Amino acid sequence: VSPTRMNLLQRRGQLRLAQKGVDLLKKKRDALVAEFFGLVREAMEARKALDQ
């Protein structure tokens, strides 16, 4: 890549975008984990019903 001030600013903007993407993905992971932990209780109830 050609080193220029405009290119440096573009790379810094890309770094900021990547960091924000990491934060957004972490929030998505938190939502998914909450859903997963509800669903595991549902699954254990279903498995007990299957045993019965």
Binding site: R29, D30, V33, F37
Partner: protein, 578 residues
């Protein structure tokens, strides 16, 4: 004195002709108004003078007078309780004789020339004296200010003034060779004051803060670096260190601070009280204050002035704590001066000798044997303020290469109301191994092992952060939940310290040691109870939790009984648990 006239004026640069015999870096008086300048280049009959203040209105042909001496400070009685700028001019007397503005070319004396001091001789005629010896004593607030013969002066005493009241200009001792010794002398700020021998970092510098004294100790005469992020409580911690340290004299250097921050320092500091005497803390500190709009020469020379004053007080046999509020601003001033000299920069515009100057400042610290045979030390706590907290700045890299401790101040901790907001993950100290024998002799032979155990517990707590982020703490196993709760206890009951509390503002080494004893004993008992089948939540309800939480606020003289009682009841509470 070499006297010449102005030949050319170009901004702050003045070329003076007829200056043959003038020496490099001597202070000169430029023009009829006597503006102070420095000789930076000699060429034939001419000298290049860099004027400190604005040169507008100067004309060609005005006299230039050389003082014959480089930049120096007056060392003697009258510096305590004083406020100076970067070149040691008393700001209060400047205000008295000039007003709210600092006018150019004002002449003031660093030490008051009218005040009488109670002189008490300690030498007799015929005695032979050398540099650093004590000629006599003078009372200055709670101190006995020792009048020292200058380090380069030796001879035989001829006449001694008897006990009485004299000003600092009165010659108290005159030698056989006609040398008159006064209550004060002058020393160049860029030359380190000589000592007999530099000692090893054996004894600790006790700041009174548990995290600093235990986890990241600095040795007496060591150097520490701190970052100043906004909202971290840096000023509370700095003034707490000034109040509660085991240093006799405090020297605070403000190099090019913001006007309002410098005002904050100059207003809050006189209100601090000295716990050793109950009077003002200012009676044992010297404040050096510079704003961003003062001359760049004073801002660059401020730290050298401060370290020279600290070295003088060390040579009197005291322990001195030196705090530089922003070495980043001093580095900015150095960069500006180098740019004015048209020097090729290194890295981000800084001169290639930035690290050399930083080392020359920091290496003046240390515990020494003075020329007078006594012991004294200078401990320097420097502060760095990068552009946006980016430590990659050359100033911070240069500082961290030479300082022995780094107390990472974090704004995130202060946001969570964790004070002092010192990030124990990023902080470090290189003095622990050298200080270990002192700890074993003076607080407990067990102490290093306890400190390592507490550090390991903190590391284990930090290792679980991503798991606790992913799932709640209630999803953790009892072993992991135990270390999470013990990390919480360690933080909130050992690491946190209230600087405004009447007894919690200060903590001795033994009280801190007892707190870690209690915490680790509780952790071991709980770890045994876990493998006895006991679940976590009965352990979390034990009153020993509150007992350990209250250990911070018990007074120093009541702590040993409280500690033994707490140890007994921590032993008892887990035995009765199912």
């Amino acid at each position: 004195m070499i006297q010449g006239v102005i030949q050319k004026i170009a901004g702050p640069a003045v070329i003076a002709k007829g200056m043959l015999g003038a020496r490099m870096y001597d202070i000169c008086k430029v023009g009829e108004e006597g503006l102070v300048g420095e000789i930076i280049r000699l060429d034939g009959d001419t000298a290049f003078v860099q004027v400190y203040e604005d040169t507008s209105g100067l004309k060609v042909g005005e006299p230039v007078v050389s003082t014959g001496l480089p930049l120096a400070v007056e060392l003697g009685p009258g510096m305590l309780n004083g406020i100076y700028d970067g070149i040691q001019r008393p700001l209060e007397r400047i205000r008295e004789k000039t007003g709210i503005y600092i006018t150019r070319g004002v002449v003031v004396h660093a030490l008051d020339r009218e005040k009488k001091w109670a002189w008490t001789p300690m030498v007799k005629p015929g005695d032979e004296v050398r540099g650093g010896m004590v000629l006599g004593t003078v009372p200055e607030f709670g101190f006995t200010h020792k009048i020292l013969v200058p380090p380069d002066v030796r001879g035989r005493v001829k006449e001694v003034k008897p006990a009485g009241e004299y000003t600092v200009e009165e010659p108290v001792v005159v030698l056989e060779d006609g040398t008159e010794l006064k209550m004060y002398h002058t020393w160049p700020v860029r030359r380190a004051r000589p000592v007999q021998r530099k000692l090893d970092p054996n004894t600790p510098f006790l700041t009174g803060m548990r995290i600093l004294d235990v986890l990241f100790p600095v040795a007496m005469g060591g150097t520490a670096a701190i970052p100043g992020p906004f909202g971290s409580g840096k000023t509370v911690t700095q003034q707490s260190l000034a109040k509660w340290s085991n240093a006799d004299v405090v020297v605070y250097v403000g190099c090019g601070e913001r006007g309002n921050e410098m005002t904050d320092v100059l207003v809050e500091f006189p209100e601090l009280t000295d716990p050793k005497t109950g009077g003002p803390l200012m009676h044992r500190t010297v404040l050096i204050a510079n704003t961003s709009n003062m001359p760049v020469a004073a801002r660059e020379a401020s730290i050298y002035v401060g370290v020279t004053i600290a070295e003088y007080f060390r040579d009197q046999g005291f322990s001195v704590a030196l705090m530089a509020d922003s070495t980043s601003r001093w580095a900015e001033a150095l960069r500006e001066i180098s740019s004015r000299l048209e020097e090729m920069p290194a890295e981000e515009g800084y001169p290639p000798y930035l690290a050399a100057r930083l080392a020359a400042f920091y290496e003046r610290a240390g515990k020494v044997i003075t020329l007078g045979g006594e012991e004294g030390a200078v401990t320097i706590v420097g502060a760095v303020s990068p552009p946006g907290g980016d430590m990659s700045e050359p100033v911070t890299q240069s500082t961290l290469r030479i300082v022995g401790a780094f107390w990472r101040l974090d704004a995130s901790l202060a946001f969570r109301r964790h004070f002092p907001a010192i990030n124990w993950n990023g902080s470090y100290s290189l003095f622990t191994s050298a200080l270990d024998p002192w700890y074993r002799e003076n607080v407990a032979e067990d102490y290093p092992e306890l400190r390592d155990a507490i550090s390991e517990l903190l590391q284990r707590e930090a290792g679980l952060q991503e798991i606790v982020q992913l799932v709640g703490p209630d999803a953790l196993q009892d072993a992991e939940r135990l270390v999470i709760e013990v990390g919480r206890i360690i933080r909130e009951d050992f690491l946190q310290q209230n600087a405004y509390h009447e007894v919690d503002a200060y903590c001795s080494m033994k009280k801190a040691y007892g707190i870690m004893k209690m915490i680790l004993a509780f952790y071991k008992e709980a770890e045994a109870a876990i493998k006895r089948g006991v679940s976590i939540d009965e352990i979390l309800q034990l009153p020993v939790l509150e007992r350990i939480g209250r250990a911070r606020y018990v007074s120093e003289e009541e702590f040993p009984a409280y500690f033994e009682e707490a140890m007994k009841e921590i032993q008892g509470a887990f035995k009765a648990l199912a």
